[PDB]
């Protein structure tokens, strides 16, 4: 229960300490002391960064604020931003600038103001790195708060992803990419929260873009959105898209995505993916022969439905007994699966027959 006048005097303190003349005087006395003869060298940038960081933090989570206070806060941050940013267009000031960005997005309460903020950030994006990442975070948060401007911000984020010279120069890394796709997923979920038809338009647009090294980014985004909507008319479209998108070293990470897709825990999806893997194994794209079993190695450790566990165990036992008619690589996954279960006492005699056949084949081949 902080009374308001303490906030007012804190604003007075912060506006008094951001004076530049006092900084110049401190620099002059620092020079006098240095020439008179110590850890710090220049106080201006560190003091400014500390003061802006505390300004951002100490007014971060505080709520229940009427109109005059927030409008004057917005005045402070906008005038400081205009004075500061419009001068370095010729180091550590970017952190303070990003603090100003994070503070000013809290002090907005009008949809038109949000639209103006999005327009300015879109203008600055399509051309310091902390400033860009904080701009992306602010765009994501603002889109999360206001569902109206989602269609306004949907293209601005996609055009950068589908087309990034800075990333190309950096390659010759991925944190910005993953935070960007996370913001994309948050924007999509916020949009579909209010409008049940925007997601269909977005998936149609991404399918059209896929039709026309962008496939790697597209596949990663598709995997991220698919795992994002695991709970929720939405799983069937992505299922059919991934079914129809098959077909080239680009197939290495597709099954990697399928391994994560297995986690969702749907009987039909599990049957489809297991049938696809069985067909691939029977045919043996020879290069994928290793990759697929690697996917199994990842699948074996990420199953939580016991029904799926026993079904997978039976399926791989049947696959092993069928392939007997090269076979020494299928044991590690069985060991990993069986190390997660207590010793078995009795079950369906089908399991007993499968185990007996497996041991018979093992002793025939002399693996023991």
Brief characterization of the structure:
Acts on phosphatidylinositol (PtdIns) in the first committed step in the production of the second messenger inositol-1,4,5,-trisphosphate. The chain has 368 residues and is mainly alpha-helical. It is built from 19 helices and no strands.
How would you describe this structure to a colleague?
By secondary structure, this protein is mostly helical. It has helices spanning 4-17, 20-36, 44-58, 67-85, 93-104, 111-125, 129-145, 150-162, 165-171, 175-194, 198-211, 214-228, 235-244, 252-262, 267-283, 288-300, 306-323, 331-338, 349-365. Helix 3 (44-58) packs parallel to helix 5, helix 6 packs antiparallel against helix 7 and helix 8 runs antiparallel to helix 10. The radius of gyration is 29 Å and the shape is elongated. It starts with a helix and ends with a helix.
- Global Rg: 29 Å
Largest sheet: none
**Protein structure class:** mainly alpha
- Count up the helices: 19
Identify the overall geometry: elongated
What is the CA-CA span between the terminal residues? Answer: 73 Å
Helix content class: over 70%
- Number of E strands: 0
Proportion of strand residues? under 5%
Sketch the topology as an H/E string, one letter per element.
HHHHHHHHHHHHHHHHHHH
List the helices and strands and how they pair.
Layout: H1 4-17, H2 20-36, H3 44-58, H4 67-85, H5 93-104, H6 111-125, H7 129-145, H8 150-162, H9 165-171, H10 175-194, H11 198-211, H12 214-228, H13 235-244, H14 252-262, H15 267-283, H16 288-300, H17 306-323, H18 331-338, H19 349-365
Helix pairs in contact: 3-5, 4-5, 5-7, 6-7, 6-8, 7-10, 8-10, 12-14, 14-16, 16-18, 17-19
């Amino acid at each position: 229960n902080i009374p308001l006048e303490m906030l007012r005097e804190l604003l007075n303190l912060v506006k008094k300490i951001v004076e530049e003349a006092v900084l110049k005087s401190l620099d002059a006395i620092v020079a006098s002391v240095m020439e008179a003869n110590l850890y710090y060298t220049s106080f201006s940038d560190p003091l400014y960064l500390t003061m802006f960081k505390m300004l951002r933090d100490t007014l971060y989570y505080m709520k229940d604020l009427p109109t005059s206070f927030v409008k004057e806060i917005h005045d402070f941050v906008l005038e400081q931003f205009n004075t500061s940013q419009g001068e370095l267009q010729k180091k550590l000031r970017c952190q303070a600038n990003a603090a100003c960005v994070d503070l000013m997005v809290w002090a907005v309460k009008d949809e038109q103001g949000a639209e103006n903020l999005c327009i300015k950030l879109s203008e600055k994006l399509q051309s310091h790195l902390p400033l860009l990442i904080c701009c992306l975070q602010g765009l994501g948060r603002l889109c999360e708060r206001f569902p109206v401007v989602v269609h306004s911000v949907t293209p601005s984020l996609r055009d950068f992803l589908v087309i990034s010279p800075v990333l190309v120069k950096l390659y010759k890394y991925e944190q910005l990419r993953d935070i960007a796709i996370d913001n994309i997923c948050r924007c999509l979920k916020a949009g579909l929260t209010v409008d049940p038809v925007i997601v269909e338009a977005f998936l149609a647009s991404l399918s059209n873009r896929l039709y026309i090294l962008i496939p790697d980014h597209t596949i990663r985004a598709l995997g991220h959105i698919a795992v994002a909507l695991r709970d929720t008319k939405v799983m069937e479209p992505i299922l059919q898209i991934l079914q129809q998108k098959f077909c080239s070293p680009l197939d290495v990470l597709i099954i990697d995505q399928l391994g994560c897709l297995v986690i969702t825990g749907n009987q039909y999806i599990y049957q489809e993916v297991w049938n696809l893997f069985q067909q691939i194994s029977v045919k043996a794209y020879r290069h994928c022969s290793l990759a697929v079993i690697n996917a199994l190695a990842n699948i074996a450790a990420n199953i939580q439905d016991e029904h799926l566990v026993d079904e997978l165990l039976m399926n791989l036992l049947e696959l092993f007994v069928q392939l007997g008619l090269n076979l020494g690589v299928l044991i590690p996954v069985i060991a990993v699966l069986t190390r997660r279960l207590p010793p078995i006492k009795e079950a369906k005699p089908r399991l007993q027959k499968l185990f007996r056949d497996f041991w018979l084949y093992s002793v025939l081949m002399g693996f023991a």
